[PDB]
């Protein structure tokens, strides 16, 4: 589901920056190591030259030229690794900007993601409320009210239906009552 | 405003509902009494 995928992408970015941080460690490891190499190399060059310089005056001259050839060969190795160092340096700062660029991407993606979810979730909640408030076209609570109101109207009808019979015998009987009723009215005329 | 509108709907629905039930229940009770009083057409106590 998109909710799950979306936060998963956030989680992925957290792994990514961690991977890039060690990758930084790997490149920097070679900067350190290649400093170490040049530092050694420059010593080695001097050292055997020093042996050779005494060897000029002392015993075998010829042997000193061998030591110098070894020295010089190694000097070439150092210069070759100086070439490699240049590649390291340039690549390193390229990687530094690439991390910063990714960090910007992540930062924006995360903030956008958060407000995207929030404003969407808020909107749907509002819509659910307006629907349930409104009942546009039809609203079931009124239909339930109506059902029991139909029963009221039925009972109302039925109640006056008992009245509909209740009247129609009585007129015979009532006439006898009214004769008696007139008598007490005649007693009032007597008292007057 | 939508809450206030609903609150009005609820308030009226409830008061209407209450008096609807009461007046209906009162009416049926009256009708039951008038029937049992009257025996219009026939009345079993007179038959006994």
Curated annotation (Swiss-Prot), chain A:
Its main location: membrane. It is found in: Cell inner membrane. Keywords: Cell inner membrane, Cell membrane, Coiled coil, Membrane. It is a peripheral membrane protein. Disruption phenotype: Essential, it cannot be completely disrupted. Cells with very low levels of protein have no ordered thylakoids, are barely green and are non-photosynthetic. GO terms for cellular component: plasma membrane. Residues 3-133 form a coiled coil. It comes from the Bacteria. Belongs to the PspA/Vipp/IM30 family. Required for thylakoid formation. This is Membrane-associated protein Vipp1. It comes from Synechocystis sp. (strain ATCC 27184 / PCC 6803 / Kazusa). The gene is vipp1. The chain holds residues 24 to 215 of 267 of the full protein.
């Amino acid at each position: 589901d998109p909710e799950k995928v979306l936060e998963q992408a956030v989680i992925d970015m957290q792994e990514d920056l961690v991977q890039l941080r060690q990758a930084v460690a790997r490149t920097i490891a070679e900067e350190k190591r290649t400093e170490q190499r040049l530092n050694q190399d420059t010593q080695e060059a001097k050292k055997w030259e020093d042996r050779a310089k005494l060897a000029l005056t002392n015993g075998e001259e010829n042997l000193a030229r061998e030591a110098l050839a070894r020295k010089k060969s190694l000097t070439d190795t150092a210069a070759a690794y100086q070439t490699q160092l240049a590649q390291q340096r340039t690549m390193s700062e390229n990687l530094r900007r690439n991390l910063a660029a990714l960090e910007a991407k992540i930062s924006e993606a995360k903030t956008k993601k958060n407000m995207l979810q929030a404003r969407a979730k808020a909107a749907k909640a509002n819509a659910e409320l307006q629907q349930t408030l409104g009942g546009l076209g039809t609203s079931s609570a009124t239909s339930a009210f109506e059902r029991m109101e139909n029963k009221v109207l039925d009972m109302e009808a039925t109640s006056q239906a008992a009245g509909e019979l209740a009247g129609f015998g009585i007129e015979n009987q009532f006439a006898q009552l009214e004769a008696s009723s007139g008598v007490e009215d005649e007693l009032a005329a007597l008292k007057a």
